[PDB]
Amino acid sequence: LSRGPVAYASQKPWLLNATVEENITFESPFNKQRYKMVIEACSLQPDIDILPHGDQTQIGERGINLSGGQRQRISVA
Amino acid sequence: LSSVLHQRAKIPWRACTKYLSSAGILLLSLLVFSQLLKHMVLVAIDYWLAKWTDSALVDQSVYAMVFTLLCSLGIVLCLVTSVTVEWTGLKVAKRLHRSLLNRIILAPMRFFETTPLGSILNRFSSDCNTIDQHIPSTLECLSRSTLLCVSALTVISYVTPVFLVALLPLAVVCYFIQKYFRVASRDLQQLDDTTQLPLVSHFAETVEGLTTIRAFRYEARFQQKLLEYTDSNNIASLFLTAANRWLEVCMEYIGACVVLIAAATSISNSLHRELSAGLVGLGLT
Amino acid sequence: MLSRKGIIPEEYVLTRLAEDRERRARFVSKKGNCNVAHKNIREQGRFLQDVFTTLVDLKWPHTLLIFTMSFLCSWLLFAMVWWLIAFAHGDLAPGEGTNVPCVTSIHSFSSAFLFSIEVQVTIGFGGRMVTEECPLAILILIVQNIVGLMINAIMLGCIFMKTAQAHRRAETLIFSKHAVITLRHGRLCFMLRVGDLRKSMIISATIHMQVVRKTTSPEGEVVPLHQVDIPMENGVGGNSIFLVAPLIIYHVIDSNSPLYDLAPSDLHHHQDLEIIVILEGVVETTGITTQARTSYLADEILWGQRFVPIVAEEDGRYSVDYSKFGNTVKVPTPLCTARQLDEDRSLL
Amino acid sequence: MPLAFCGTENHSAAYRVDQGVLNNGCFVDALNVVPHVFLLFITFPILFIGWGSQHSTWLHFPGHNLRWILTFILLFVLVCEIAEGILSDGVTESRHLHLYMPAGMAFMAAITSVVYYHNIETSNFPKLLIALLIYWTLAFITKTIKFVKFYDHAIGFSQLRFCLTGLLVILYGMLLLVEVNVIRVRRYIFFKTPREVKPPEDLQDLGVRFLQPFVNLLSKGTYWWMNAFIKTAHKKPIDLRAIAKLPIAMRALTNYQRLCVAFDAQARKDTQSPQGARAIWRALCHAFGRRLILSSTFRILADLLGFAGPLCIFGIVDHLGKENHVFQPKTQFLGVYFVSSQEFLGNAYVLAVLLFLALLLQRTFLQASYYVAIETGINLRGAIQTKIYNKIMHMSTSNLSMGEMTAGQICNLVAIDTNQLMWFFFLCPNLWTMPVQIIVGVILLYYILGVSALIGAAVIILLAPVQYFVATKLSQAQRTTLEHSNERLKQTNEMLRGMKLLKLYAWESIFCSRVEVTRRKEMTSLRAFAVYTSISIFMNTAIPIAAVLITFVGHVSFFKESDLSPSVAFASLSLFHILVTPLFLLSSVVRSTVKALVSVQKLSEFLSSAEIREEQC
Numbered sequence A: 001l002s003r004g005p006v007a008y009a010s011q012k013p014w015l016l017n018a019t020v021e022e023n024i025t026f027e028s029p030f031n032k033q034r035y036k037m038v039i040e041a042c043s044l045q046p047d048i049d050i051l052p053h054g055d056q057t058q059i060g061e062r063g064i065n066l067s068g069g070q071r072q073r074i075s076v077a
Numbered sequence B: 001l002s003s004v005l006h007q008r009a010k011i012p013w014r015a016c017t018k019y020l021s022s023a024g025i026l027l028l029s030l031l032v033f034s035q036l037l038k039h040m041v042l043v044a045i046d047y048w049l050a051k052w053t054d055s056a057l058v059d060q061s062v063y064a065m066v067f068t069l070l071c072s073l074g075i076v077l078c079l080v081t082s083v084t085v086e087w088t089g090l091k092v093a094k095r096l097h098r099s100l101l102n103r104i105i106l107a108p109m110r111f112f113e114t115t116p117l118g119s120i121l122n123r124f125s126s127d128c129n130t131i132d133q134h135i136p137s138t139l140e141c142l143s144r145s146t147l148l149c150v151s152a153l154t155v156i157s158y159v160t161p162v163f164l165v166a167l168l169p170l171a172v173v174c175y176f177i178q179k180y181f182r183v184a185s186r187d188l189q190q191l192d193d194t195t196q197l198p199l200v201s202h203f204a205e206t207v208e209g210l211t212t213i214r215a216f217r218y219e220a221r222f223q224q225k226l227l228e229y230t231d232s233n234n235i236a237s238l239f240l241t242a243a244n245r246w247l248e249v250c251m252e253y254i255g256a257c258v259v260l261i262a263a264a265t266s267i268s269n270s271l272h273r274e275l276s277a278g279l280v281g282l283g284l285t
Numbered sequence C: 001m002l003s004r005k006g007i008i009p010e011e012y013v014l015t016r017l018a019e020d021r022e023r024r025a026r027f028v029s030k031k032g033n034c035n036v037a038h039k040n041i042r043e044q045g046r047f048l049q050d051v052f053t054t055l056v057d058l059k060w061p062h063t064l065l066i067f068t069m070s071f072l073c074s075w076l077l078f079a080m081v082w083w084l085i086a087f088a089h090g091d092l093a094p095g096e097g098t099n100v101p102c103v104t105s106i107h108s109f110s111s112a113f114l115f116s117i118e119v120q121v122t123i124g125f126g127g128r129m130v131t132e133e134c135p136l137a138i139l140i141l142i143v144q145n146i147v148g149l150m151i152n153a154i155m156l157g158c159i160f161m162k163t164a165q166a167h168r169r170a171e172t173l174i175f176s177k178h179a180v181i182t183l184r185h186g187r188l189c190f191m192l193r194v195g196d197l198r199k200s201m202i203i204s205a206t207i208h209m210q211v212v213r214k215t216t217s218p219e220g221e222v223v224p225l226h227q228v229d230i231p232m233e234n235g236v237g238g239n240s241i242f243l244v245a246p247l248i249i250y251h252v253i254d255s256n257s258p259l260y261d262l263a264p265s266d267l268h269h270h271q272d273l274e275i276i277v278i279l280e281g282v283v284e285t286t287g288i289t290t291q292a293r294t295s296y297l298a299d300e301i302l303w304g305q306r307f308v309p310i311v312a313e314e315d316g317r318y319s320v321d322y323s324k325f326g327n328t329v330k331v332p333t334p335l336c337t338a339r340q341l342d343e344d345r346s347l348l
Numbered sequence D: 001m002p003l004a005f006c007g008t009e010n011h012s013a014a015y016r017v018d019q020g021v022l023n024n025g026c027f028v029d030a031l032n033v034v035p036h037v038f039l040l041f042i043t044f045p046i047l048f049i050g051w052g053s054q055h056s057t058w059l060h061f062p063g064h065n066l067r068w069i070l071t072f073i074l075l076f077v078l079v080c081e082i083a084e085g086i087l088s089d090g091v092t093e094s095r096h097l098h099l100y101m102p103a104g105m106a107f108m109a110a111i112t113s114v115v116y117y118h119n120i121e122t123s124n125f126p127k128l129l130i131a132l133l134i135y136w137t138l139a140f141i142t143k144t145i146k147f148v149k150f151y152d153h154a155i156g157f158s159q160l161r162f163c164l165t166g167l168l169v170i171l172y173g174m175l176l177l178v179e180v181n182v183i184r185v186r187r188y189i190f191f192k193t194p195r196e197v198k199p200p201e202d203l204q205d206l207g208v209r210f211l212q213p214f215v216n217l218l219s220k221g222t223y224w225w226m227n228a229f230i231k232t233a234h235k236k237p238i239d240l241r242a243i244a245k246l247p248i249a250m251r252a253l254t255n256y257q258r259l260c261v262a263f264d265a266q267a268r269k270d271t272q273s274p275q276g277a278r279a280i281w282r283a284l285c286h287a288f289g290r291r292l293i294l295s296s297t298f299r300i301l302a303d304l305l306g307f308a309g310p311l312c313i314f315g316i317v318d319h320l321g322k323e324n325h326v327f328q329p330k331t332q333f334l335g336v337y338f339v340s341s342q343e344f345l346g347n348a349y350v351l352a353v354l355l356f357l358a359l360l361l362q363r364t365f366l367q368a369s370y371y372v373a374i375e376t377g378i379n380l381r382g383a384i385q386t387k388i389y390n391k392i393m394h395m396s397t398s399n400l401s402m403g404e405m406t407a408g409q410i411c412n413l414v415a416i417d418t419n420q421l422m423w424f425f426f427l428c429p430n431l432w433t434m435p436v437q438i439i440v441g442v443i444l445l446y447y448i449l450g451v452s453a454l455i456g457a458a459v460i461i462l463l464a465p466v467q468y469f470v471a472t473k474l475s476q477a478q479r480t481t482l483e484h485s486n487e488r489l490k491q492t493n494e495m496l497r498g499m500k501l502l503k504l505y506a507w508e509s510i511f512c513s514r515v516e517v518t519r520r521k522e523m524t525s526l527r528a529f530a531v532y533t534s535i536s537i538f539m540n541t542a543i544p545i546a547a548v549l550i551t552f553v554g555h556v557s558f559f560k561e562s563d564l565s566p567s568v569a570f571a572s573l574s575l576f577h578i579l580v581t582p583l584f585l586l587s588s589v590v591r592s593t594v595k596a597l598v599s600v601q602k603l604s605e606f607l608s609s610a611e612i613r614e615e616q617c
């Protein structure tokens, strides 16, 4: 069907400072069921539950602090 | 819009009164008297110039000593006003930082458990630096400008009372222009700052994540996002500049009308009622 | 000088960020105003006929100002020209000259102004009059009579058209701001309320109901503002109605009606369902046909509510409480869809 | 005594028709009244329909600048003619209405003409513009007639009215040409086919509110459209919905395209261009010289007219300070008095009115120059940011090429360097003007005050560099304060982030004492900063007073050449005030130029780094 789109996630994770849903979706059409399955698989429940707003917190640097493993999981998601 | 209507206020009592009370008792009188004395001495220097040139066209003969005395007194008064303004600003910053620090000492735990640390860091860095460096100069220049404005309306009224009569319409128009301009300006300024911060944050994050961005081959999407942000900043700055220019233009016309009125009344008085020429020249200047 | 806006950043002072209806528009308003952007339309050149039409359509005080200015400008213009011509022929010069003037007793400009008044208003005092031996005077007199007569004719025409039209400038047909969906005679049905306020009988009162939604066709077609007409569930199926006392225009919902898939969950504000109700008719007093548009969005519909009866049987006649007009009280109305309700009724 | 139109002398024999009418000055003057009366009568109904009615409608005729500049010159010279006439009738007791009222109604007609054109431009109805075309030529004919008669009776350029009439003749011609140019382009009258007119596609959409680039030239001067916006600000607070997308001419993409064109041109013809700093300067100049030149021309004219203020005050005061103070126009021709211009300028009221007009024009020009320079700077900021980002995308993340310039450094570059560049373009008009303003100021001061003003203005001339040195060491003090402040902020953030931990530790006292000690260390440098900014304020606001005192004392005692006439002294004072202002910005201008050079060096260095480009299929 010059190279096609390639997914990637470096050793040191890279984060925005925006909403978590925007952070993971990364400018893609929001598929609700797929996103829920992904976050459930990504072990994101503890952080979103403990986060004050949940799935709308200001994630990333200069926002709400996270953990390296949590950030890596968010990236892989 | 009750909340919006309440939002539109100078807010002098809440903060300005606190500032001035934290200033002290000595330095408030020192600053006020120094400012007023310096500008009154300036007006007096101009008036004495007027009288000296009036008598020049043929009381005393050698005015120059009085002129030198007024000049020296004015120089000293300006120095005193400057030093007082700087001293007041420094002392306010000193006697505010320590108070805020001791207040944050006694905060409860729930306060930290609810309020984001972004707010405390903001109010502890940005506001502190502003009142360290930007509040004294702004206050000083505002005082200088408003007092010179008062002097340059009073003097021209003294030259021709008809100007004083005609001042009320023009001063009313000035009041309305000022009020509306402030109402728009506060908003535009805040908007400018808000629109500014995302842009630089975007730049930082795009620098820290280049590999991923190239990986998705989604470079065009971020190009569009940057274009959108840059436009959103440029147009806010453009409107800020345009509102500033509108203020400047309208006040410029008002000043020009003041010039016309003062000149016409002054010449009319100096043709028939024989007003002293020097006073005319001082008023027009 | 001033702070010069402080052009000395010298540091990017990092500051952590701190916390500190309009989606869908309406092309028909509850009052009836219509707003639709007619963007990118080839524009026909506005002839002077547009200017004349705007003249006819202005208000009363503004018409008075227009015509006073028109008359005064005509009088002053021709007074100017009369003064000019009398001046060019030596009439305005010192007296006792043998030359007979173009116009008798023209001394000043004010004299010519009064003479112009006399000529155009057809007053003609006659202390000042036109003579022979000045053909330009006769030419301009002819021109001025023709112009003044055309101006009087146009003034009369404007006044006539105003007297004719303005009698029919009152629109006092009132709907409700809320409509309902309630069970009547077993079947679910939409209801709305309409009344007439200026006590003028409305001949041939026609009512049209229209559902506008972006309904993409099953085959695939996409339609932005598809409009479907809705019957009125009259006694004969026609759209003629008679309005004296406020009515309830109950469009019964059947399998054909597009309201066959409506649910209270679908009644949420942000839905693409919009009802247009249009009351066409001619007012007996004037005879000029009029419309009465009204629109209803999902948030303006109130499920399962009946209306307060209004017609009170007073001792002599019937009273109509317009104050209790748009008040709705709840009732036991199910939230099932029309199809499920029909199947349930059939199975029972 | 009745008020006449022409002389009441000789039993009002001025109305004769001896030797043809056109040989009578009174009659030809009245003839000019007619076209203006005709316009005022015929248009005023058609206009009055305009203010009564039951957004995207925008267009501009091919001549739209020329007409407003010409009509402004026309109304200005009309006011001048009014002054000339009003002075010309002082001798006789009669009103002598003919000397000015023609020109007065001409001025009123010109105002109505511009209003009528505007109200026929908004609603695009070109045919209705015919009602103005004839007006020009008819108002031309009589006026031209008026001119030639003066030439017959030997009036000549010696008399002011001859010059004014012969000048607004040229004006009427130069705008009759404009009207026929409109006819030639759009072809609305007596042509079978008119060319289509399409509103600018940026405004074709109804969303845009910042329509400032495309409004009538007067509105762009006085920002009248802003009122509409400004009122909205009071009723409802401002949100990003209110400010729509900017016009297509101002999108950052468009500025990037222009900058790319400049770079391509400077890299094609100049083969040996490694795209260094000088190349960047060349590209920026080639991209924005037209707008910088527009701004600079406006600023220079504004400065020149600002000078006229003090000189006008001098004229008023000197003509007013005469012990005889009696004047009268002397020459005349055929029973009517003519005022020579070399005596016309003396008239005090005339001078005051002319001063007011010059001040209007100066202030409008100065504000417009500010706006154009700022807008050009803003577009350049957009272009520079887009270019920097576009170089970021192609940047390479090698360890040497990515570690030496971390994210913080490059983001600081974006913030500081681009803002400094924008400020340099803000001030670039001033670096071509402040020299001219200062030079003309010192020259004029010398001309007004003899050999004393040069000796006395060197005080401000030398006190400006003192302000520069003070600002430099002030910036150094600010940098030291910033270093201490960053240390204090780091310490405070560390103490505050672990707040609950500190509270449990009960160790808040020591860490806050350490923060206090650091604060005192910073407070010493802040003391220095405040002291030096106080010295800045004192110098800037008291050097003028000392300079004035020195000038006057030296003139009276040292030179003792003559008396200090009030006109001279007040011209000196006002000129000193007007001249001192740029002398206080010159230091900031020079510093901004230096910082802009440094910033462009940084930007070129960052633009000449590693780049990895994939193969293109």
Ligand SMILES: CCCCCCCCCCCCCCCCCC(=O)OC[C@H](COP(=O)(O)OC[C@H](N)C(=O)O)OC(=O)CCCCCCCCCCCCCCCCC
Pocket (backbone or CB within 6 Å): D065, D069, D072, D073, D076, D213, D217, D218, D220, D221, D222, D360, D361, D364, D365, D368, D372
């Ligand atoms: C000596 C006689 C004294 C009395 C008479 C004064 C005569 C004044 C006429 C001008 C003086 C001569 C200098 C020439 C400059 C004239 C202005 C001029 O040409 O600028 C025009 C510029 C350029 O347009 P643009 O929007 O950038 O678009 C370009 C367009 N597409 C193009 O084709 O190029 O766009 C602009 O112009 C940019 C905006 C600047 C606004 C300029 C305002 C000044 C005009 C006059 C204002 C009068 C004062 C206000 C009166 C109000 C009364 C209450």
